[PDB]
Amino acid sequence: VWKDADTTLFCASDAKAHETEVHNVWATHACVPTDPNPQEIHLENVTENFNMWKNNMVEQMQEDVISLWDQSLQPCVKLTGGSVIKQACPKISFDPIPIHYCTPAGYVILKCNDKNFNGTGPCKNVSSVQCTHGIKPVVSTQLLLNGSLAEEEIIIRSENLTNNAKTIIVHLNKSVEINCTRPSDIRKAYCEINGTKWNKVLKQVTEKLKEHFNNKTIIFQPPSGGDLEITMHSFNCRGEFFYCNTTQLFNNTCICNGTITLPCKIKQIINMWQGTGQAMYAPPIDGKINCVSNITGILLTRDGGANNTSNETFRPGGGNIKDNWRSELYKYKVVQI
Amino acid sequence: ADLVQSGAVVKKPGDSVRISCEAQGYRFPDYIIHWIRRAPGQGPEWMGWMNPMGGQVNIPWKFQGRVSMTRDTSIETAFLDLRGLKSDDTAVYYCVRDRSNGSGKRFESSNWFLDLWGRGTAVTIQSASTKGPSVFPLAPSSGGTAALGCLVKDYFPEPVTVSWNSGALTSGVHTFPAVLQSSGLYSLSSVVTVPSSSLGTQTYICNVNHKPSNTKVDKRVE
Amino acid sequence: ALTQPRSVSASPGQSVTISCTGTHNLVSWCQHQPGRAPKLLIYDFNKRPSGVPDRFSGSGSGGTASLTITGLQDDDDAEYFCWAYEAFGGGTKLTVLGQPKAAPSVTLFPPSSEELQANKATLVCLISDFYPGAVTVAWKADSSPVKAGVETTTPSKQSNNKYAASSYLSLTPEQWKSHRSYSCQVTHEGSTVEKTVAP
Ligand SMILES: *[C@@H]1O[C@H](CO)[C@@H](O)[C@H](O)[C@H]1NC(C)=O
Ligand SMILES: *[C@@H]1O[C@H](CO)[C@@H](O)[C@H](O)[C@H]1NC(C)=O
Ligand SMILES: *[C@@H]1O[C@H](CO)[C@@H](O)[C@H](O)[C@H]1NC(C)=O
Ligand SMILES: *[C@@H]1O[C@H](CO)[C@@H](O)[C@H](O)[C@H]1NC(C)=O
Ligand SMILES: *[C@@H]1O[C@H](CO)[C@@H](O)[C@H](O)[C@H]1NC(C)=O
Ligand SMILES: *[C@@H]1O[C@H](CO)[C@@H](O)[C@H](O)[C@H]1NC(C)=O
Ligand SMILES: *[C@@H]1O[C@H](CO)[C@@H](O)[C@H](O)[C@H]1NC(C)=O
Ligand SMILES: *[C@@H]1O[C@H](CO)[C@@H](O)[C@H](O)[C@H]1NC(C)=O
Ligand SMILES: *[C@@H]1O[C@H](CO)[C@@H](O)[C@H](O)[C@H]1NC(C)=O
Ligand SMILES: *[C@@H]1O[C@H](CO)[C@@H](O)[C@H](O)[C@H]1NC(C)=O
Numbered sequence: 055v056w057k058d059a060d061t062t063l064f065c066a067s068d069a070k071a072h073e074t075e076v077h078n079v080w081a082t083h084a085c086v087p088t089d090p091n092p093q094e095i096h097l098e099n100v101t102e103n104f105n106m107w108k109n110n111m112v113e114q115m116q117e118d119v120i121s122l123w124d125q126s127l128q129p130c131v132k133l134t135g136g137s138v139i140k141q142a143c144p145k146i147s148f149d150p151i152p153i154h155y156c157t158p159a160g161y162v163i164l165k166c167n168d169k170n171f172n173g174t175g176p177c178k179n180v181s182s183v184q185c186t187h188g189i190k191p192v193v194s195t196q197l198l199l200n201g202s203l204a205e206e207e208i209i210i211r212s213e214n215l216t217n218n219a220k221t222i223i224v225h226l227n228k229s230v231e232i233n234c235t236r237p238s239d240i241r242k243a244y245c246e247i248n249g250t251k252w253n254k255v256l257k258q259v260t261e262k263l264k265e266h267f268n269n270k271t272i273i274f275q276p277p278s279g280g281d282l283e284i285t286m287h288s289f290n291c292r293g294e295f296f297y298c299n300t301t302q303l304f305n306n307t308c309i310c311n312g313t314i315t316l317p318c319k320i321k322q323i324i325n326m327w328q329g330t331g332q333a334m335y336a337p338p339i340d341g342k343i344n345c346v347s348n349i350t351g352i353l354l355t356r357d358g359g360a361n362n363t364s365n366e367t368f369r370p371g372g373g374n375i376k377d378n379w380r381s382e383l384y385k386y387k388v389v390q391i
Numbered sequence: 392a393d394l395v396q397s398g399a400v401v402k403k404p405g406d407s408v409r410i411s412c413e414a415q416g417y418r419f420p421d422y423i424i425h426w427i428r429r430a431p432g433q434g435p436e437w438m439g440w441m442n443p444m445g446g447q448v449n450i451p452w453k454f455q456g457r458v459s460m461t462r463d464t465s466i467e468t469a470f471l472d473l474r475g476l477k478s479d480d481t482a483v484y485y486c487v488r489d490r491s492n493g494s495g496k497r498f499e500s501s502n503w504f505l506d507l508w509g510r511g512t513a514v515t516i517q518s519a520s521t522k523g524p525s526v527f528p529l530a531p532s533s534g535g536t537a538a539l540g541c542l543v544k545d546y547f548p549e550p551v552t553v554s555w556n557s558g559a560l561t562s563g564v565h566t567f568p569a570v571l572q573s574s575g576l577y578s579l580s581s582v583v584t585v586p587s588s589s590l591g592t593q594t595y596i597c598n599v600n601h602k603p604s605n606t607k608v609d610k611r612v613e
Numbered sequence: 614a615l616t617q618p619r620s621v622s623a624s625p626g627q628s629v630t631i632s633c634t635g636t637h638n639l640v641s642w643c644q645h646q647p648g649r650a651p652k653l654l655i656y657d658f659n660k661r662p663s664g665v666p667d668r669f670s671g672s673g674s675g676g677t678a679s680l681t682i683t684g685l686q687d688d689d690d691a692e693y694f695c696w697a698y699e700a701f702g703g704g705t706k707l708t709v710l711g712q713p714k715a716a717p718s719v720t721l722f723p724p725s726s727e728e729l730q731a732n733k734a735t736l737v738c739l740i741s742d743f744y745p746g747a748v749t750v751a752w753k754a755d756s757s758p759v760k761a762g763v764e765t766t767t768p769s770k771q772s773n774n775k776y777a778a779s780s781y782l783s784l785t786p787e788q789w790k791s792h793r794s795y796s797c798q799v800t801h802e803g804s805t806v807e808k809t810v811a812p
Contacts, residue, residue, distance in 0.1 A: 393650065394650075427701075431767075432702055432765075432767075433703075434614075434617075434703035434704055435694060435696075435701040435704070437699040437701065437702065451699070485650075485651075485664055487651075494799075498654075500641070500656050500660075501639055501657050502638070502639040502640065502641050502656060502657050502696070502697060502698065503641065503696065503698055503699075504641070504653070504656055505641065505643060505646055505651075505653055505696070506653055507650075508643075508650040508651040508652070509650060510648070510649070510650045511648075511650075525731075527725045527728050528725055528727065529722045529725065529737065530722075530725060532723070535736055538720055539728060540722070540737075542722075542725075542735070542737060544733075544735070546804045565739070565741065565777070567739055567766075567777055567779045568766060568767075568769045568777070568778075568779065570764055570765075570779065570781060572764045572781075573764065578781070579779075580737050580739060582720065582739060586694075591769075612661070
């Protein structure tokens, strides 16, 4: 028998002690080797109540990724409310690696396997595991990248959908390549997406969203206000910071039939996603900077009000990167033996 | 722990206004901030919420383009901006702190949790100028009941001083609060209950006096 | 967006219930003393935070939510508001009755001959000596109503702890003598009191 509980977890990885890539350096000294013989356990004829919006695994992954980025990235200058330190800012190697989250002694993780689970309801076929799967800690905005795909249907996740201050996550059946590239002025880059693929996927997402909002019509709009990391799709490709204008992806007129290319830019000064302050980087490296990623999640915020109108609008971007972890951690739940 | 709001102000039609909200005693970066509106004679009206971490905003159509919710985490102050003011924008605005939403340990409220409230900032849209009053007599008509008075039409701003018959009639006088009408002008009414038998034996006079307009009137009523 | 009546009243020791009608979402409540910063009282229907007494409570189901304050004091005299996300109630003035009830004394004047000499008609309708100060003015052409041209007022306290207000009906000369009658009704705690003027 088990009860719900919260305890300190630890992490597991396949990191190399000799690598200079920054995630491997963090993961050899913060994590242990992956379970050499893992095996899951069915919990026959048992039901449990998962709730992906109050999971402490998420807070712990947040603190972990913060520590990793705090030691890992080397800006020339870091400014944090009056204080500003200046340090050597060498280039770094950077490519996220999958991380598992293991329970300590006297606890175990439960796994919701209901193919179309929405993160909050009860669960049919519950499993017991030692660790999570390999979760890649990739901070990004608007788009969720290099994650996992929904088993059967596209799934729409929120705390309530009738609250507009609470983020909504959409999990796709089918990943869509975003092929970002800076070719061999030095900051202008561009992200490319197969327009036919992406627009079919977006029509399917519209159909689901109409399913949950009373058949009502829905439309997409660019983000309304705030700093660049919200208004545009921001991410990190090999130490450089990409900012891409995503408006051509949320193109209602074309629910385009070829290649969409987003104007991306590499930025020298950024605001740290840890809420901390702003940091200055060194000019980008030379050569072809490539980044082929899977789009396997979107985050939306619904325009408040307009309960009068016969349509609902949705803009990309949802709060702070903690929820990205939810995107993968939704199906787990640590309990006390 | 409170939200300090900036002082009240007046503006002209069109025009635009900026208001602060200095957060004190808590972590400003966490928990979003709603801006709400109370206009004279109407129930509260939400204007949008603003996540102070990145500056993301959620604003209903009624206010797209015309409003911007910003912040400056360096001095933990939110900001509301309204452009192109008309009359229906004359109101008292509050910044308020949600605590069931944002980054940080939220309060646990399924509805919105409006923990902390500012004191309010009044903006008044004076589509006026100055001018004076135009006073006209409220005549009596039809036990010994008899009421008369003194209407004071379209002036700006307060106050006006009404004194019946140069300070001879003072009992039963009732001057009512002045109205700020559609135009953003002032206008009021002053009555008195008299003896019905006194009509015909002694007549009475308004004494309207708009000092900032330099206006001294007398208007007799029959 | 959400209805909510305009006035409650009771006397230092009993109990009152303000309600919010609208639609079936959860509602929180807020007290607003004159010019002060409002204060959260109870959230999610029945739940109550800390720093607030057990006398305030509430519930809700079926379309309307209830907020109850028992054992009233002379510091609960304030406006109360409710909300369900971004649907807001109009507010409810809570009066702690220190004096007894009073019905409105309403007086309705015509537009003077001098007013029409300069082509503007204004019907004045003054309201006097009522307690509490929660009035509802209404003007009606002969038999049918009017909503445009009306400019009312918030009740103010007089020299003796009751209330007053005014109401002006601005009109054009032709639509002054357009028809037969015109009247400024005053609704106060349950019932109206209706005056009437004619050309
Ligand atoms: C999640 O599923 C449960 C039933 O399993 C349901 O009650 C709840 O509304 C669902 N949540 C969302 C956001 O769809
Ligand atoms: C429950 O999860 C297991 C995972 O091993 C899956 O294979 C199985 O099909 C699920 N149960 C049902 C009834 O689909
Ligand atoms: C991208 O998605 C494809 C599915 O077509 C999958 O085979 C591949 O492993 C994914 N790559 C990632 C997640 O890096
Ligand atoms: C995506 O989900 C929709 C409906 O939820 C379904 O019709 C479609 O088959 C799914 N895609 C795949 C590749 O199965
Ligand atoms: C990605 O784009 C680059 C340059 O645009 C191209 O050379 C490469 O073939 C592309 N790769 C894929 C998998 O689309
Ligand atoms: C884009 O995707 C479609 C799938 O619908 C397929 O024809 C091909 O992979 C791409 N087509 C073009 C013209 O790039
Ligand atoms: C839309 O609502 C109508 C009922 O008016 C219904 O026929 C239809 O099933 C609804 N849409 C979907 C996608 O089911
Ligand atoms: C993205 O492009 C469109 C049109 O230019 C628009 O949303 C906006 O100007 C761009 N986004 C920016 C500049 O952040
Ligand atoms: C939406 O798609 C098509 C492009 O073929 C066109 O209607 C329009 O220019 C697009 N809008 C954008 C890219 O903002
Ligand atoms: C996504 O995965 C690909 C393949 O592993 C990798 O090259 C790329 O850097 C990843 N993108 C991000 C933003 O981490």
